[PDB]
């Protein structure tokens, strides 16, 4: 129930809400069916349209009119935005030269430059290219302020999981918005586009950048607006309020479009219909800037020009169909489109089994065009699988389809040729960042970076403590002129022992094998200098990497590589080493297929054993220093250490070997030199975050040995790469993975043919950033360079995509 009897005569867009039943004046009451009776008529005003023109010049003031063009406007707050240029010769701000903003030039009372965030539903990123011609306003903020060529949405790319990333900092699965539709079964309760549901404050966690700005004493603008509510009339409002008095003015705002998303969906990406669309978002900027220009805040406002996702070409006949696939189509709940998402219709159903489900799903089509997976099988780069919103069964569609449950769902629900909510590395879903204003660089491109980044820098922006979020503070500082945010490394919480040779090889009793024993004081001491770290320069190029929690670990130090080893874990956290582009590759040799050595510095109480792994019959082990790349014969006796061994499923070997015996040496030629940091992770929750030795479900049979969830490589050269890896001067370069060590290849379709067709495809879609693997293994990479702090943090959040050219 409404009172809409109230009235909101002078509470026109009123910043506080007012609580039910009490009717509504604010910029979302029509989305509540709340609005005091008389809202359209003294707050949509519409009369005589949204420009001045030269009659209109100097006139009396009508209150009836949208906006006024009389001499008491600019005190008013209400002219026309383009009052200035009509009635006082002024230019448009698109006109202008653009000249470096060096400080702020703010109107006497603004304590700090305001934010505006002009946020554009569907706006993907080769718009700023390919529609230049027809976004003049647009494309002087992009070429005069800070862009990047193109910002990564989160998965799913749909609207409101990334308007509220970009409000909160936070994955999906962290806030709750996990997709435009959802099910909370806790809640036992309905998310949807349409309805009354989604108002509920329940589904939103985290803490979006306008609460955290009123926590701190910042006034914040309403950010959202009902949909009926003109383009035109929202930046009047924001214009408005930013003519209020200094103690009641808002600091942040934020502008929300639609379009292009709107008309995208209806004609596809690159329709002929969609230049219109972009034209008018164009003048919406425009008036925009002419209305900041007016009240002399052109050159003191932070103005944020940023997309929630792009938009790809997909038609009805690209649509794959459940019922093709399934016997029990009736049994499932599908969300259906650019995502799949499977449960239970009933959870009264005991014969509903999601193993049968996924391998009726699996490659059972040769141009099959989604691929389905448990969510913790996901990518873990999508970081979505930690929230009870997210089903446990997830189809991963291809770009350009739709996967639906049966087709009556597709004809009975072609019309549209546009969508979008794909796997966020994919092009045509990446969306735009720009920024303009005192605080931001002038004409600076600056690296692709991702959505999670920006709450952060909103934060920066307007002196505000950001909450805990998943951005890393200061990767963005290079976008900024000031308010940069100078982080200190974390303290590394466990120093490391040293051991020396402490074990005779008869107290050992792990059922391993080595045909070793066949034997020089020239050689003798240098294999002593190899084992206290002479070699450790070559082969740890940017320091240690520093252990964040309690643990008891050894360094150990060996001609070929080094490694951090756990004697919680039995294995290694790290194993570090420098292949050059000159090394060669070697084989195991046949006396050594089987060998396994125990090592002397390690009791055999934190050592692994053989015999665990003949007992096992599912497990394997491998190495994490490849023996293939040992610098000779008698350097490859290290890499059969025991304790350079972890738990390999023997389907994971065949993608393991092939990395190590193929790929590094295939980078190392490209890259001139690559340093690997290789290692075990343990996410048996599937959280993003590594394990306590309590929470592994997994161990060798019989043994203590926990069986890793993943498998990483860090792999850095110089980005100059006419420098050798191990002689770098200026910026890396990096890429890295987390493979899921699964018993079986069914994720790669191809799995059946030689490692070089279906291997690098399925390291691709594991790509990494080192943030992602400093989360899941509570390590601290790249400790010791001779970089800025700032760029390291960069460096740990670049993904490499492997995406064609935007
Ligand atoms: C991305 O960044 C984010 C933000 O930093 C990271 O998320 C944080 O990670 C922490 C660890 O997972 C987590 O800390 C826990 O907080 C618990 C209290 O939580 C509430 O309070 C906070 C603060 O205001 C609030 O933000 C939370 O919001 C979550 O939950 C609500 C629903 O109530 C949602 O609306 C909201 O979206 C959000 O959901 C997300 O997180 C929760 C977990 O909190 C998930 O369940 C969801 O799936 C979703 O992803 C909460 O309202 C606190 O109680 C926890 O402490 C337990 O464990 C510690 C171990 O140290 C132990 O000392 C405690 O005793 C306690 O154990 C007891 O409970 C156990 C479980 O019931 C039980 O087994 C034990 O036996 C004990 O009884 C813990 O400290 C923090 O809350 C989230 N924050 C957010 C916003 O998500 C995220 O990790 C980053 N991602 C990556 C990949 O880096
Ligand atoms: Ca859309
Ligand atoms: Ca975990
Ligand atoms: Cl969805
Ligand atoms: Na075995
Ligand atoms: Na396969």
Not at 171 to 196: C, T, W
Request: proline residues 7%; charged residues 25%; hydrophobic residues 30%.
């Amino acid at each position: 129930w409404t009172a809409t009897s109230g009235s909101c005569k002078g509470r026109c867009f009123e910043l506080q809400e007012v609580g039910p039943p009490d009717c509504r004046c604010d910029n979302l009451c029509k989305s509540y069916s709340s609005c005091c009776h008389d809202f359209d008529e003294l707050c949509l005003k519409t009369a005589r349209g949204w420009e001045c023109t030269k009659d209109r010049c100097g006139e009396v003031r009508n209150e009836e009119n949208a906006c006024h063009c009389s001499e008491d406007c600019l005190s008013r707050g209400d002219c026309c935005t383009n009052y200035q240029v009509v009635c006082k010769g002024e230019s448009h701000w698109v006109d202008d030269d653009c000249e470096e903003i060096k400080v702020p030039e703010c109107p006497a009372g603004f304590v700090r430059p305001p934010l505006i965030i002009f946020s554009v539903d569907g706006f993907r990123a080769s718009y700023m290219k390919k529609g230049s011609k027809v976004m003049p306003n647009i494309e002087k903020l992009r070429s005069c302020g800070t862009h990047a060529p193109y910002m990564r949405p989160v998965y799913p790319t749909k609207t409101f999981p990334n308007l509220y990333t970009l409000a909160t900092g936070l994955y999906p699965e962290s806030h709750g918005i996990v997709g435009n539709s959802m099910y909370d079964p806790v809640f036992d309760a309905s998310f949807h586009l349409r309805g009354r549901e989604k108002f509920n404050h329940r589904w939103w966690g985290g803490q979006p950048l306008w609460i955290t700005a009123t926590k701190q004493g910042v006034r914040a603008g309403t950010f959202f607006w009902s949909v009926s509510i003109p383009h035109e009339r929202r930046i009047l409002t924001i214009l408005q309020w930013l003519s209020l008095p200094d103690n009641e003015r808002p600091s942040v705002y934020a502008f929300y479009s639609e379009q292009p998303d709107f008309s995208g969906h209806k004609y596809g990406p690159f329709g002929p219909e969609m230049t219109n669309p972009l034209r008018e978002i164009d003048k919406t900027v425009g008036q925009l800037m002419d209305g900041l220009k007016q009240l002399r805040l052109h050159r003191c406002v932070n103005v944020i020009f940023v997309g929630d996702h792009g938009m790809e070409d997909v038609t009805c006949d690209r649509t794959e169909f459940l019922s093709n696939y399934l016997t029990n189509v009736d049994d499932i709940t599908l969300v259906p489109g650019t995502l799949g998402r499977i449960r239970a219709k009933s959870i009264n159903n005991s014969k509903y089994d999601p193993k049968t489900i996924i391998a009726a799903l699996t490659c059972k089509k040769p141009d099959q065009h989604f691929k389905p997976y448990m969510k913790q099988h996901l990518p873990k780069r999508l970081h979505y699988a930690n929230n009870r919103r997210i089903e446990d069964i997830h189809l991963l569609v291809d770009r350009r389809w739709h996967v639906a449950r049966k087709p009556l769902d597709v004809y009975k629900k072609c019309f549209f040729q546009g969508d979008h909510g794909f796997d966020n590395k994919v092009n045509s879903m990446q969306t735009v960042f720009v920024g303009y204003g005192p605080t931001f660089k002038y004409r600076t491109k600056v690296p692709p970076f991702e959505n999670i980044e920006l709450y952060n820098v909103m934060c920066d922006l307007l002196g505000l403590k950001p909450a805990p979020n998943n951005g890393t503070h200061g990767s963005l500082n290079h976008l900024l002129r000031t308010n940069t945010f100078r982080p200190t490394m974390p303290d590394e919480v466990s120093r490391p022992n040293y051991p020396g040779i402490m074990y005779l090889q008869s107290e050992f009793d792990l059922g391993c094998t080595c045909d070793d024993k066949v034997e020089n004081k020239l050689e003798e001491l240098n294999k002593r200098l190899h084992t206290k770290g002479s070699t450790k320069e070559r082969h740890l190029l940017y320091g240690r990497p520093a252990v964040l929690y309690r643990t008891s670990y050894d360094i150990l130090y060996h001609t070929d590589f080094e490694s951090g080893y756990s004697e919680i874990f039995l294995m290694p956290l790290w194993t570090s080493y420098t292949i050059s582009k000159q090394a060669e590759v070697s084989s195991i040799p046949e006396h050594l297929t089987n060998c396994v050595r125990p090592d002397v510095r390690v009791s055999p109480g934190f050592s692994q054993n053989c015999l665990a792994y003949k007992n096992d019959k599912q497990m394997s082990y491998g190495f994490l220093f490849p023996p293939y790349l040992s610098s000779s014969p008698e350097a490859k006796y290290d890499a059969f250490l025991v304790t350079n061994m972890v738990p390999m499923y023997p389907a994971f070997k065949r993608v393991w070997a092939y990395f190590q015996r193929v790929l590094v040496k295939k980078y190392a030629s490209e890259r001139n030199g690559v340093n690997v940091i290789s290692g075990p992770i343990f996410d048996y929750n599937y959280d993003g975050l590594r394990d306590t030795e309590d929470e592994i479900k997994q161990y060798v049979e019989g043994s203590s040995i926990p069986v890793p969830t993943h498998y990483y490589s860090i792999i850095t050269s110089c980005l100059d790469f006419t420098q050798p890896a191990d002689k770098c001067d200026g910026p890396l370069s990096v890429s890295s993975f987390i493979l899921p060590h699964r018993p079986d290849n069914d994720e790669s379709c191809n799995s059946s043919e030689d490692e070089s067709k279906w291997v690098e495809e399925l390291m691709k879609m594991h790509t990494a950033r080192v943030r992602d693997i400093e989360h899941l293994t509570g390590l601290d990479f790249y400790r010791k360079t001779s970089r800025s702090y700032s760029e390291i943090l960069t460096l740990k959040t670049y993904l490499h995509t492997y995406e064609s050219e935007i």
